[PDB]
């Protein structure tokens, strides 16, 4: 059901929810994500660090936490909760 | 008043007595103030005869 | 007319029945502390309120108060106990206090109109409250106009005697509305003593025009008006009937400064010829140019500091110097747009008086004419308001048989807890005022007429009607009127007897499947409005004790976001939002540039400061003479700095 | 299906509004039909108006001049009633002299090879002794209601003064339909608009232009 | 920074996570976005020009600021701030004009009519502060009221009056039903929905109709469906059924699975429905669901052909009361002298104002069809101070936060769960709990067991069962070090599922406590500030008999202890503070039992009393029964949780009596209880606020004077445990995204995608 | 004049289901001409249906039908589905008899040449045991959806669309975000396509409103070429 979700919307948070803990913990995990993805396109990040991403077919100016949220939908990356 | 417009008016009753001057509130206060020759008229239709 | 005639009650009653009328109090917490004189209240030389009356019923009109309440036997007439504001309410016996007094603060908030079109149905007071109300041209002496001009009328007297009356022309009033009146006679007439010689701003041929009378709908249409919402035809903002006139003035001086005497000049440090083309040889802008917003009105320059090395290169490098100098210069606030109607220029050359030290002094006159925008506050007489939800094109509207589109739908919700029956009142009576109406009496007339006078029946179209607070029309007379309806062009008739009719919706083309309720409503136009409201910031100054930014001047007010919104936000748990909201939003001296350098370059945005106001509170701990010390895990004393 | 074509014929009941009927054709076909001319006959119709005004002794639309008894934003007002009627292809100029006692109306506006005033009996101004008005309005072509075009978008420097152009040649449209048997005889609708113009042009040219545009968008 | 506001006005047209936005309002916030983006672009060359090309309103930027704005939530807020609904995030789109549009579904969150209000507009800039814009924040993931766990997002005043008309159900309409004759067939049946829609296009037939037709796409009630089928669901399979036109096109608006309902939809139908959806489902389909409601609501809103006049209005009532009045008038001549009866009286005037009132209510329903425009609206449903409280509520519950998933706590509270032979209070006491030990019945057979969120269907479940009471886990009891476990506090009202460890719940409670407050509000300041009862209230010191002695100077109550002890007498209470009311019912008398907790007057019971009495345990059960008992009789819904937040702050200092350490400071219980004489203390919200750890929070309170002089003399440390403190020096809230759990998450990708 | 172009797309939910949009319109033109489309068509398109069907043993009863699970309304309600292109253009009998136990799918009627059946696996009626059925059912052309005439007088479906619904949205920021974008949804039946269907909608307005355009050709039109 739910026809399509727009924008905002997409992903779901039901189907997001089942990725982390808590509501809180999916901040936290989309959020760092998106820290990630934004060096790598400016360039290479901090310090003796290579980052990496975007893991997902990136959409036409698709921002770098709406990706991240895609990512997390498709169990592309898993953290450490805690 | 002489240039007033045509309203009809549903009142089946009479208004003998005009609205006074609604402006007087403040005029008739300080011409009392000053002492007005215009408020020394008052005594023309007079009262306690003295103006001060 | 309404400021005058106000009271301070600081120092409800049988006494103050008659005397001053807690009807007209404000709706805010000083309720009861502030209420206007009543209509016909008379104050005795002592300072008693002197109620007049008519001793019972005797013709002569004595002074009643105490003293007359100690013998109390009939009243002086309807409305003792009504006020001006409150008076001019039709159908005032009908709605609630609470209505009745806001519609009274709802009239002495109307803007006014370039037409100025007067009430197609009211009270009598709109007469008597024009004239007296001091803005309006009142003749002195009986005789003849000898000339008459938008800029004065000239009156021969049959005495021989020649009075001038000069017309206030656009004048900025107090809070920025214009003031324009309109001379409404011509050189051959004739005028009698006291006659009204030209309108004011919100009078019409001599009574008191606040709004205009439109076409309404009462049927909720798609939501459009849902819940106070208005919506609007787009014929009102093509005829500029709701378009008002706004003004506002801006000031600026000269010398007398803090380093030496500044000057006003044209030339500014460095800008392109292109940005100082609308300015004059003085550097003020020219009157009649359009002005948009961070436009100069008056070119000024500053004693320099002259006293960096980066800029200097570049300067010496294409020729330009070091001519001081700080730019300090008159531009329009950010949000307005205007023409600039006219100039005043005080200089030191002439021998005017100024303040000391100060050399020039000018001020730039900007007027706007207004559009009815969406969001524009709109209200009537009987208290209602609400703000305009969306401005339709005249093609997609309901619209009578005749094809005659509404002009405003309202909705009916209101109704079943509120009640504001005058409302619906005034709403047939203004079509029965438009299109007339003929009681076509067979064999006598009807026993609504009963009560009736002869001169009420049959009246032509586009009629004006009096309806007196409590003497005033009856539900009896009302529907024997919305039985008689003079038709249209074509003969058809458009309202029935119920006040309602067919509408066929603009957009679909299917007529609405019942009556709707239409009809002619006075509105008014209030003073709150979009271009004034609306506020948006990114960047901006910030204040000099807290670092706060600060709003409140001519440009980029920021918003608060109070402890009650903190509460809020900790609600949601976002630790985040909150923390930049707090810090590098607001207060973080380091914190507020890197982020918008980091935006600019598109980085990451970085982990917010101290946040200026928490530095603060450390120092006034510190000046109580409490040692306070901010101790991290080891290095036991940090020193912020 | 009982096949017989739609067909329009004209009427008149004014000159500057006449009817029209089209019948017959399916039930249902007359309410959404009517009133989709109706949308398109009060917007879309290509019409004349006048965009900028310039009055020699006026710098800008708040002040008065000096003779007249109708302050200059009170003439604008009185100079939106100007119905007007133009091909012009391009922006073209009016002129309006007029001096001492008298009433300035629309028929003391010269119109220039092309364009023509269609109310020379409106109201503008009145003149007095003292009172000189010359003025100068530029017709331009558009459709619709454009607002003032501000001289800072276009530059038309201080002289000008825009003014709100409507160009809508249409007044007063509406309509009313009679569905004929209705028994089990046969079905079908007939209806009939009531077109209404400013005399710009002819209520059948106004309903052609109407019918092309939705002839064109159709697709 | 960053913030602006406007005038607000109906965005009928958006969907529930869009906003209307100024694009002037928008380009100015955005101002330094823009200016990136048309900056990597050529159209300005630098910075510096960009600038000016954004400020000038140059249209090459409009293209340019759609982009930017996509996908980019804002955060708007109306004051004042009541609950945290007052401020949610939208997808902000451009729009024309200077005017906000706000979706109508969130006016009752916002609490935002449409005259001449503003709302103020913030944009969150970090990636984290859109995340917990996007997640916590959105305006569709918030729908049930975090006090009660009701919608706040259900249509309202014009959609219930619109689908009260769709609905609705007229016999005698035009595409009535009409049963097979011998002559001709049922003419009410219809090929498939469709075909109605096609009939009621032309003349055939009433959407308001009762005919009968074959739905495929549509699920039948659960009642006929077992009958029909059986045999599984029908995705494509047929039925039919009698309903009204609108019925099915109201259903349609509904979720597929969802069964059908055919009924005329009231506002506490509606209600109803909403509820059922957002268990049954996720949010994201409730969210559209009553999105859609939203547009049918307002579509036949418009046809519904609602519309006042004066003939709906107008009052019959005139003769009816010229007749009464004189009825009352020549009472005075009677009244006077020879047939007063002093007590006839005033029983003649009662009885005849209520005979009046009988007969104006039937006048009311005598002169107006049932389709009346009022009386329609009336039956669908349709139709400062505070602050204070609120905010010392808020600074002795701001640092209550669930921190641990389970303590493993044994022992909670009593549900009075279903009166039998069904309580109202169930819904704000038992719902959404979870079960400290299994609900047995008496036949053996275990029903819902512990640890269960006690949702609706359990209580039903449970309520056929025939238990009476039930034991819940509750914060009162939670013994969590530090603030409460997620299991003893249970559903969170705003989420429908468990609550999540992260939550702050002393605020949600206080903000739940506060906004009502717009036998009243001065009387919930005595209680949760502990004060003595204005008029005390006598409470049972022993179980026994009761010996009631009636005197002119005052009552007097003697308990006769069961035990054989000395007597209880409680003497000298006012006349008027009258006795306190009871398988057979009635009012208190002589002789009757009283056990210990019982309350002997009608009044209120010092709390502190009852603490030395009962236990510190039943004075929290009759804090929460006295507070919520004021809020029941406004009509206000508030889950017990919430009040109970507030009444576990107080309990938890104690009184050391005396010397080991020393005299009676109010300490803390964990702190006492968990190293090795002392008390249980009462003490009000103002003055538990004030012993809280930290002084710099405890001095932003009240009276930062004394509250300095004793912390600098003992140099009181303040750790920076509570958030009030990291708010102050700006600092990272040790709740929600600030706890160490979830800020420390370390976050890299599958080696399985990076290679990929 | 001249006018921005528009957009006509297609996307295709089902085979028999599709909804098109129309990007961007001048305001108000979604409302204009949507409307129209609609009721164009719904009721314009011409198509073959069910007028009376007659079977063997009824005209005394009503309801019941011995020799059939399938009660006379419910009957009706499956040949109302059935769907029949007939270039006849008058009334023809068409034939079905099927006797013995088994199920009727429309595939047992006999088609008159010129007719076709374009569902044969449409469920008509089951047959009872040891039971026959002769059905013959009337046939004509028409436009929309006529009521029952008032032997088995029933609703005819002319029309091959069945549910049509529109709407509009704003699009187009550019410098006026309040452009019209026209959403249309339309379910047709197999006789023809839903993108065929458009078209004879169009091709009949077109002719419609060109009565207007010929009487004078000459008025100035807007057109976006
Ligand atoms: N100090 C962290 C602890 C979070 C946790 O692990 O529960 C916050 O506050
Ligand atoms: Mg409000
Ligand atoms: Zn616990």
């Known amino acids: ?82 | 008043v002489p240039g007033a417009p045509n309203r009809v008016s549903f009142a089946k009753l009479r208004e003998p007595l005009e609205v006074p001057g609604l402006l007087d509130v403040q005029t008739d206060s300080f011409e009392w103030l000053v002492g007005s020759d215009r408020w020394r008229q008052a005594a023309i239709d007079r009262g306690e005869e003295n103006p001060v | 007319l309404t400021h005058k005639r106000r009271l301070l009650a600081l120092g409800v009653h049988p006494s103050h029945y008659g005397r001053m009328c807690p009807i007209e109090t404000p709706e805010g917490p000083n309720i009861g502390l502030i209420g206007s004189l009543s209509v016909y209240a008379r104050v005795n030389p002592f300072g008693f309120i002197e109620t007049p009356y008519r001793k019972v019923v005797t013709d002569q009109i004595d002074y009643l108060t105490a003293d007359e309440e100690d013998r109390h036997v009939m009243d002086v007439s309807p409305r003792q106990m009504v006020s001006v504001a409150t008076a001019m309410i039709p159908f005032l016996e009908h709605d609630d206090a609470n209505r009745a007094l806001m519609g009274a603060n709802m009239q002495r908030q109307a803007v006014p109109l370039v037409r100025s079109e007067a009430p197609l149905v009211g009270t009598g007071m709109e007469l008597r409250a024009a004239i007296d109300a001091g803005d309006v041209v009142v003749a002195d002496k009986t005789g003849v106009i000898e000339e008459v001009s938008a800029d004065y009328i000239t009156v021969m007297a049959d005495d021989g005697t020649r009075q001038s009356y000069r017309l206030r022309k656009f004048a900025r009033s107090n809070h920025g509305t214009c003031a324009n009146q309109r001379p409404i006679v011509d050189a051959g007439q004739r005028v009698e003593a006291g006659q009204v010689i030209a309108d004011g701003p919100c009078t019409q041929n001599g009574e008191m025009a606040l709004g205009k009378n439109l076409l309404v709908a009462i049927m909720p249409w798609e939501g459009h008006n849902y819940e106070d919402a208005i919506i609007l035809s787009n014929r009102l903002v093509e005829e500029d009937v709701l378009t008002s006139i706004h003004i506002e003035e801006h000031e600026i001086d000269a010398r007398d400064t803090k380093l030496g005497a500044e000057e006003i000049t044209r030339d500014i440090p460095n800008v392109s010829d292109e940005v100082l083309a609308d300015l004059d040889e003085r550097g003020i802008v020219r009157i009649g140019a359009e002005v948009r917003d961070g436009d100069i009105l008056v070119g000024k320059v500053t004693p320099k500091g002259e006293t960096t090395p980066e800029e200097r290169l570049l300067r010496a490098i294409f020729g330009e110097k070091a001519r001081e100098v700080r730019d300090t210069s008159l531009k329009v606030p950010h949000g307005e747009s205007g023409k600039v109607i006219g100039i005043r220029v005080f200089s030191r050359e002439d021998d005017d008086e100024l303040p000391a030290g100060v050399n020039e002094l000018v001020r730039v006159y900007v007027a706007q004419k207004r559009k009815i925008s969406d969001g524009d506050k709109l209200a009537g007489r009987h208290g209602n308001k609400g703000v305009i939800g969306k401005i339709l094109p005249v093609e997609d509207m309901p619209f009578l048989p005749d094809g005659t589109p509404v002009d405003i739908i309202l909705n009916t919700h209101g109704v079943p807890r509120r009640m504001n029956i005058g409302q619906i009142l005034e709403t047939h009576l203004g079509w029965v005022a438009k299109a007339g109406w003929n009681i076509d009496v067979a064999a006598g007339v009807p026993d609504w007429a009963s009560k009736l006078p002869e001169e009420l029946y049959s009246a032509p179209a586009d009629s004006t009607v009096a309806t007196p607070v409590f003497d005033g029309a009856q539900e009896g007379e009302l529907a024997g009127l919305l039985g008689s309806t003079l038709p249209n062009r074509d003969g058809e008739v458009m309202v029935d007897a119920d006040g309602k009719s067919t509408l066929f919706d603009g957009r679909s083309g299917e007529p609405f499947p019942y009556p709707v309720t239409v009809g002619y409503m006075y509105i008014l136009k209030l003073h709150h409005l979009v271009d004034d409201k609306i506020h948006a910031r990114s960047t901006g100054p910030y204040s000099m004790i807290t670092q706060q930014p600060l709003g409140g001047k001519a440009q980029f007010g920021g918003q608060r976001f109070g402890e009650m919104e903190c509460w809020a936000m900790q609600a949601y748990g976002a630790a985040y939002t909150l923390q930049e909201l707090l810090t590098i939003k607001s207060d973080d001296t380091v914190g507020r540039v890197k982020v918008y350098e980091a935006i600019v370059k598109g980085e990451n945005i970085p982990e917010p400061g101290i946040p200026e106001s928490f530095k603060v509170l450390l120092k006034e701990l510190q000046s109580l003479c409490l040692n306070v010390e901010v101790l991290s895990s080891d290095g036991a004393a940090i020193e912020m700095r | 299906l009982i096949s017989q074509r739609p067909t329009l014929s004209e009427e008149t009941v004014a000159e500057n509004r006449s009817r029209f009927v089209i019948e017959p054709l399916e039930p249902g076909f007359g309410y959404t039909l009517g009133n989709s001319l109706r949308r398109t006959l009060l917007s879309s119709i290509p019409g004349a108006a006048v965009t900028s005004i310039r009055i020699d002794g006026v710098l800008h639309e708040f002040t008065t001049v000096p003779g007249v008894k109708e302050d200059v934003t009170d003439i604008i007002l009185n100079l939106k009633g100007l119905v007007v009627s133009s091909d012009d292809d391009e922006p073209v100029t009016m002129y309006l002299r007029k001096q001492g006692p008298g009433v300035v109306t629309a028929g003391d506006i010269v119109p220039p090879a092309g364009v023509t005033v269609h109310n020379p009996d409106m109201h503008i101004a009145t003149l007095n002794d003292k009172g000189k008005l010359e003025v100068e309005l530029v017709v331009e072509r558009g459709r619709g209601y454009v607002p003032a075009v501000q001289n800072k978008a276009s530059g038309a420097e201080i002289g000008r003064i825009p003014v709100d152009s409507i160009y809508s040649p249409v007044l007063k449209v509406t309509y009313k339909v009679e569905a004929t048997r209705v028994e089990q005889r046969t079905d079908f609708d007939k209806l009939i608009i009531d077109v209404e113009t400013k005399n710009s042009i002819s209520p059948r040219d106004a309903l052609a232009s109407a019918g092309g545009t939705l002839v064109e968008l159709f697709g | 920074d960053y913030s602006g506001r406007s005038v607000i006005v109906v965005g009928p047209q958006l969907k529930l996570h869009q906003c209307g936005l100024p694009k002037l309002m928008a380009l100015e916030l955005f101002k330094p976005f823009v200016m990136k983006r048309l900056v990597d672009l050529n159209h300005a060359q630098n910075i510096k020009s960009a600038k000016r090309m954004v400020e000038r309103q140059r249209p090459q930027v409009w293209d340019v600021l759609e982009e930017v704005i996509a996908e980019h939530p804002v955060l708007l807020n109306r004051a004042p701030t009541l609950h945290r609904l007052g401020i949610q995030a939208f997808e902000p789109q451009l729009v024309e004009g200077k005017a906000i549009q706000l979706h109508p579904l969130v006016c009752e969150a916002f609490n935002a009519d449409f005259d001449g209000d503003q709302m103020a507009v913030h944009l969150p800039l970090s990636a984290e502060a859109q995340a917990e814009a996007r997640i916590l924040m959105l305006s569709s993931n918030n729908i049930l009221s975090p006090a009660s766990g009701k919608p706040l997002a259900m249509p309202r005043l014009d959609m219930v009056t619109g689908l009260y008309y769709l609905t609705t159900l007229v016999e005698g309409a035009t595409g009535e039903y009409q049963a097979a004759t011998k002559d001709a067939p049922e003419q009410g049946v219809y090929s498939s929905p469709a075909e109605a829609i096609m009939a009621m296009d032309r003349g055939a037939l009433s959407v308001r109709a009762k005919i009968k037709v074959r739905l495929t796409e549509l699920r039948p009630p659960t009642d006929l469906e077992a009958q029909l089928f059986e045999n599984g669901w029908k995705p494509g399979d047929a039925w039919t059924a009698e309903t009204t036109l609108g019925r099915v096109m109201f259903n349609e608006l509904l979720p597929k699975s969802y069964p059908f309902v055919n009924e005329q939809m009231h506002k506490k139908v509606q209600a109803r429905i909403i509820n059922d959806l957002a268990e049954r489902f996720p949010m994201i389909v409730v969210a559209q669901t009553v999105d859609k409601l939203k547009d049918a609501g307002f579509y036949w809103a418009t046809r519904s052909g609602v519309t006042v006049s004066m003939a709906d209005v107008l009052v019959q009532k005139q003769e009816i009361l010229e007749r009464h009045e004189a009825e009352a008038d020549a009472i005075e001549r009677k009244y006077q002298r020879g047939a007063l009866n002093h007590t006839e009286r005033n029983e003649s005037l009662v009885k005849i104002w209520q005979d009046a009132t009988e007969e104006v209510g039937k006048a009311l329903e005598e002169f107006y069809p049932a389709d009346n425009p009022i009386i329609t609206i009336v039956k669908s449903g349709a139709t400062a101070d505070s602050g204070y409280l609120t905010r010392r509520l808020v600074d002795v519950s701001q640092d209550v936060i669930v921190r641990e998933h389970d303590c493993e706590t044994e022992r909670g509270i009593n549900v009075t769960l279903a009166e039998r032979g069904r309580d109202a209070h169930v819904e704000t006491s038992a719902f959404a709990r979870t079960l400290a030990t299994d609900a047995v019945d008496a036949n053996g057979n275990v029903i819902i067991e512990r640890g269960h969120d006690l949702g609706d269907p359990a209580i039903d479940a449970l309520l056929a069962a025939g238990i009476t009471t039930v034991k819940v886990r509750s914060v009162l009891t939670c013994t969590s070090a530090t603030g409460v476990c997620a299991m003893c506090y249970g559903r969170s009202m705003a989420t429908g599922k468990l609550v999540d460890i992260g939550e702050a719940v002393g605020i949600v409670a206080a903000q739940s406590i506060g906004e009502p407050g717009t036998g009243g509000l001065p009387r919930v300041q005595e209680l949760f500030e502990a004060r003595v009862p204005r008029n005390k209230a006598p409470i049972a010191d022993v179980a026994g008999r009761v010996r009631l002695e009636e005197s002119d100077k005052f009552f007097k109550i003697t308990i006769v202890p069961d035990d054989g002890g000395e007597e209880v007498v409680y003497d000298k209470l006012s006349k008027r503070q009258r006795l306190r009311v009871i398988g057979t019912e009635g009012v208190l008398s002589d002789g009757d039992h009283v056990e210990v907790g019982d309350q002997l007057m009608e009044g209120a019971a010092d709390p502190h009393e009852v603490l030395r009495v009962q236990g510190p345990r039943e004075v929290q059960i009759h804090l929460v029964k006295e507070v919520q008992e004021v809020y029941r009789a406004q009509g206000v819904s508030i889950h017990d949780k919430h009040i109970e937040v507030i009444v576990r702050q107080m309990l938890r200092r104690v009184t050391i009596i005396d010397s080991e350490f020393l005299p009676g400071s109010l300490t803390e219980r964990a702190e006492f209880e968990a190293e090795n004489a002392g008390r249980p203390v009462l003490m009000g919200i103002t003055k538990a606020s004030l012993a809280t750890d930290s002084w710099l929070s405890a001095a932003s309170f009240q009276e930062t004077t004394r509250v300095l002089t004793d912390a600098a003399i003992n140099c009181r440390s303040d750790k920076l445990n509570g958030l009030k403190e990291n708010v102050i020096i700006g600092k990272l809230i040790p709740a929600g995204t600030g706890i160490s759990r979830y800020r420390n998450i370390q976050v890299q990708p599958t080696e399985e995608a990076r290679a990929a």
Not at chain 1, 18 to 39: E, F, G, H, P, T
Request: glycine fraction near 8%; charge should be negative.
């Open chain 1, 1 to 82: 059901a739910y026809d399509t979700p727009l924008g905002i919307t997409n992903p779901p948070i039901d189907e997001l929810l089942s990725r982390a803990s808590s509501k809180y913990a999916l901040v936290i995990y989309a959020a760092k994500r998106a820290r990630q993805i934004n060096d790598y396109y400016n360039q290479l990040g901090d310090g003796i660090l290579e980052y990496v991403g975007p893991l997902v077919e990136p959409g036409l100016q698709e921002k770098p936490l709406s990706i991240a949220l895609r990512e997390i939908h498709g169990d592309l990356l898993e953290h450490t909760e805690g």
